[PDB]
Design an enzyme around this catalytic site. Structure first.
Site, PDB file in Angstrom:
ATOM      1  N   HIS A  61       0.785  -1.232   0.000  1.00 17.67           N
ATOM      2  CA  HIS A  61       0.000   0.000   0.000  1.00 17.67           C
ATOM      3  C   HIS A  61       0.817   1.281   0.000  1.00 17.67           C
ATOM      4  CE1 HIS A  61      -2.861  -3.095   1.165  1.00 17.67           C
ATOM      5  NE2 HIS A  61      -2.291  -3.248   2.394  1.00 17.67           N
ATOM      6  N   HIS A  91       5.429   6.971   5.959  1.00 12.07           N
ATOM      7  CA  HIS A  91       5.131   6.422   4.618  1.00 12.07           C
ATOM      8  C   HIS A  91       4.710   7.568   3.755  1.00 12.07           C
ATOM      9  CE1 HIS A  91       1.379   6.353   6.867  1.00 12.07           C
ATOM     10  NE2 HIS A  91       0.863   6.799   5.713  1.00 12.07           N
ATOM     11  N   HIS A  93       2.111   8.965   0.225  1.00 12.32           N
ATOM     12  CA  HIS A  93       1.032   8.814  -0.719  1.00 12.32           C
ATOM     13  C   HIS A  93       1.265   9.674  -1.919  1.00 12.32           C
ATOM     14  CE1 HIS A  93      -1.553   6.950   2.534  1.00 12.32           C
ATOM     15  NE2 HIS A  93      -0.914   7.818   3.320  1.00 12.32           N
ATOM     16  N   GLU A 103      -3.210  13.639  -0.177  1.00  7.89           N
ATOM     17  CA  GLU A 103      -4.493  13.273   0.448  1.00  7.89           C
ATOM     18  C   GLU A 103      -5.252  14.481   0.937  1.00  7.89           C
ATOM     19  OE1 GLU A 103      -3.736   9.852   3.085  1.00  7.89           O
ATOM     20  OE2 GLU A 103      -4.355   8.748   1.350  1.00  7.89           O
ATOM     21  N   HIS A 116       3.403  11.008   5.507  1.00  5.87           N
ATOM     22  CA  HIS A 116       2.788  10.856   6.849  1.00  5.87           C
ATOM     23  C   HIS A 116       3.830  10.318   7.816  1.00  5.87           C
ATOM     24  CE1 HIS A 116      -1.450  10.777   4.923  1.00  5.87           C
ATOM     25  NE2 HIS A 116      -0.907  11.982   5.088  1.00  5.87           N
ATOM     26  N   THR A 196      -6.052   7.115   7.173  1.00  2.41           N
ATOM     27  CA  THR A 196      -6.549   7.202   5.782  1.00  2.41           C
ATOM     28  C   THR A 196      -6.492   5.921   5.088  1.00  2.41           C
ATOM     29  OG1 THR A 196      -4.420   7.868   4.768  1.00  2.41           O
ATOM     30  CG2 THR A 196      -5.817   9.635   5.746  1.00  2.41           C
ATOM     31  N   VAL A 197      -6.229   4.809   5.786  1.00  2.00           N
ATOM     32  CA  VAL A 197      -6.237   3.452   5.194  1.00  2.00           C
ATOM     33  C   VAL A 197      -7.029   2.592   6.158  1.00  2.00           C
ATOM     34  CG1 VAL A 197      -4.102   3.613   3.929  1.00  2.00           C
ATOM     35  CG2 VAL A 197      -4.028   2.822   6.298  1.00  2.00           C
TER      36      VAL A 197
HETATM   37  N1  LIG Z   1      -2.269   6.878   6.130  1.00  2.00           N
HETATM   38  S1  LIG Z   1      -2.364   7.245   7.930  1.00  2.00           S
HETATM   39  O1  LIG Z   1      -1.135   8.039   7.873  1.00  2.00           O
HETATM   40  O2  LIG Z   1      -3.629   7.903   8.341  1.00  2.00           O
HETATM   41  C1  LIG Z   1      -1.914   5.730   8.754  1.00  2.00           C
HETATM   42  C2  LIG Z   1      -1.732   4.622   7.955  1.00  2.00           C
HETATM   43  C3  LIG Z   1      -1.428   3.411   8.541  1.00  2.00           C
HETATM   44  C4  LIG Z   1      -1.269   3.198   9.916  1.00  2.00           C
HETATM   45  C5  LIG Z   1      -0.960   1.862  10.476  1.00  2.00           C
HETATM   46  O3  LIG Z   1      -0.190   1.777  11.435  1.00  2.00           O
HETATM   47  C6  LIG Z   1      -1.623   0.597   9.909  1.00  2.00           C
HETATM   48  N2  LIG Z   1      -1.538  -0.552  10.861  1.00  2.00           N
HETATM   49  C7  LIG Z   1      -0.704  -1.647  10.811  1.00  2.00           C
HETATM   50  N3  LIG Z   1      -0.897  -2.486  11.877  1.00  2.00           N
HETATM   51  C8  LIG Z   1      -1.867  -1.890  12.630  1.00  2.00           C
HETATM   52  C9  LIG Z   1      -2.428  -2.350  13.842  1.00  2.00           C
HETATM   53  C10 LIG Z   1      -3.430  -1.547  14.442  1.00  2.00           C
HETATM   54  C11 LIG Z   1      -3.834  -0.319  13.813  1.00  2.00           C
HETATM   55  C12 LIG Z   1      -3.266   0.108  12.578  1.00  2.00           C
HETATM   56  C13 LIG Z   1      -2.260  -0.709  12.019  1.00  2.00           C
HETATM   57  C14 LIG Z   1      -1.435   4.318  10.719  1.00  2.00           C
HETATM   58  C15 LIG Z   1      -1.767   5.565  10.153  1.00  2.00           C
HETATM   59 CL1  LIG Z   1      -1.978   6.952  11.211  1.00  2.00          CL
HETATM   60 ZN   LIG Z   2      -0.842   7.857   5.354  1.00  2.00          ZN
END
Ligand SMILES: NS(=O)(=O)c1ccc(C(=O)Cn2cnc3ccccc32)cc1Cl
Ligand SMILES: [Zn+2]
Length: 258
Positions: A61, A91, A93, A103, A116, A196-197
Site C-alpha cells: 500500500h 510512509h 502517498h 491526500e 505521513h 486514511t487506510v
Molecule cells: N495513512 S495514515 O497516515 O492515516 C496511517 C496509515 C497506517 C497506519 C498503520 O499503522 C496501519 N496498521 C498496521 N498495523 C496496525 C495495527 C493496528 C492499527 C493500525 C495498524 C497508521 C496511520 Cl496513522
Molecule cells: Zn498515510
C-alpha cells in the site's frame, strides 16, 4: 482484501470497514478562509534521532520506514497535543500524475505527494496497538511534496526501492534525518480525524504543515514502480495510493498561524 485498484479502492472501503463513513474521517479539504486561528496551539516540539530508523518495507500500500519505538528517543510534543507521542513509522502517498497525489487538498490544490509521520501516545498507552483505538492515541504529521529540486534525504529512500519492489519485501534502512527533511516553516493546520487506510480508526490528531518540501519528478516516479502484489503473483503496480477527501461533518480545523 483492500487496495487502490478498481474493485478494492477507496470508494469500496465502506462496504467492508463501515467506519469509512464515520464522522471523523480523513483526509479533508483544507479551506484556509474557514480555518480558525487558535492562539492556544503551541509550536511543534520535534525530536527525531536519525538512528531511530531501522527498516524499510513494501506493504503493498506504500513503503514504510519503521522506527525502533522501544523508548522515547524520537518524539513529537507541543502543537495541539497533550503529552508525548513516539515516532513509529513514515510512509508516502502519491498519484499517477504529479498533478494530483496528496491526500489533504488546500483550497483545491493537490500536491504531488504527501508524507505521513505516524506517532503514538506512550504517556497514556502501553503500545501503538492500544493507542490506535483511542481518540487521543495517534498524532500524524503530514508534509506535502511538490515537484522541484531532487531531495537528498529522499534519494536514500529511492535508492532502496529496487530491493523492495515486491509486496512484503524489507530491507535495512537507518541514519535517516527526518528532522532535516521537514520544511523551513512548521506552521500547521490541525483537526481530529482518522487513519486514511483501513482500518480507518478515528484515533488521529492530524497536524498538516502548510509549507511543502521538494522532490524531483524522477524520484517521485520511482515510487509508482512498487508492486501491490506479492512475489510470484500477477504483477500490478502501485501507481496511485491516495484516498479522496472526506466530509468535514462539523469538525473545527484550526491554524497555528495567521
Ligand atoms: N495513512 S495514515 O497516515 O492515516 C496511517 C496509515 C497506517 C497506519 C498503520 O499503522 C496501519 N496498521 C498496521 N498495523 C496496525 C495495527 C493496528 C492499527 C493500525 C495498524 C497508521 C496511520 Cl496513522
Ligand atoms: Zn498515510
Amino acid at each position: 482484501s483492500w487496495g487502490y485498484r478498481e474493485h478494492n479502492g477507496p470508494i469500496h472501503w465502506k462496504e467492508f470497514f463501515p467506519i469509512a463513513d464515520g464522522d471523523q474521517q480523513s483526509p479533508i479539504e483544507i479551506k484556509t478562509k474557514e480555518v480558525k486561528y487558535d492562539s492556544s496551539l503551541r509550536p511543534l516540539s520535534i525530536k527525531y534521532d536519525p538512528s531511530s530508523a531501522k527498516i524499510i518495507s513494501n506493504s503493498g500500500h506504500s513503503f514504510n520506514v519503521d522506527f525502533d519505538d522501544t523508548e522515547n528517543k524520537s518524539v513529537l510534543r507541543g502543537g495541539p497535543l497533550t503529552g508525548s507521542y513516539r515516532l513509529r513509522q513514515v510512509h508516502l502517498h502519491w498519484g499517477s500524475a504529479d498533478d494530483h497525489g496528496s491526500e489533504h487538498i488546500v483550497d483545491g490544490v493537490s500536491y504531488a505527494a504527501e508524507l505521513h509521520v505516524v506517532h503514538w501516545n506512550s504517556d497514556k498507552y502501553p503500545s501503538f496497538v492500544e493507542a490506535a483505538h483511542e481518540p487521543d492515541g495517534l498524532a500524524v504529521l503530514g508534509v506535502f511534496l511538490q515537484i522541484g529540486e531532487p531531495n537528498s534525504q529522499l534519494q536514500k529512500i529511492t535508492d532502496t526501492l529496487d530491493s523492495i519492489k515486491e509486496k512484503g519485501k524489507q530491507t535495512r534502512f537507518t541514519n535517516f534525518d527526518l528532522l532535516s527533511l521537514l520544511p523551513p516553516s512548521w506552521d500547521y493546520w490541525t483537526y481530529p480525524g482518522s487513519l486514511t487506510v483501513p482500518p480507518l480508526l478515528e484515533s488521529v490528531t492530524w497536524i498538516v504543515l502548510k509549507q511543502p518540501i521538494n522532490i524531483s519528478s524522477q524520484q517521485l516516479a520511482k515510487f509508482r514502480s512498487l508492486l501491490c502484489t506479492a512475489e510470484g503473483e500477477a504483477a500490478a503496480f502501485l501507481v496511485s495510493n491516495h484516498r479522496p477527501p472526506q466530509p468535514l461533518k462539523g469538525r473545527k480545523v484550526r491554524a497555528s498561524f495567521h
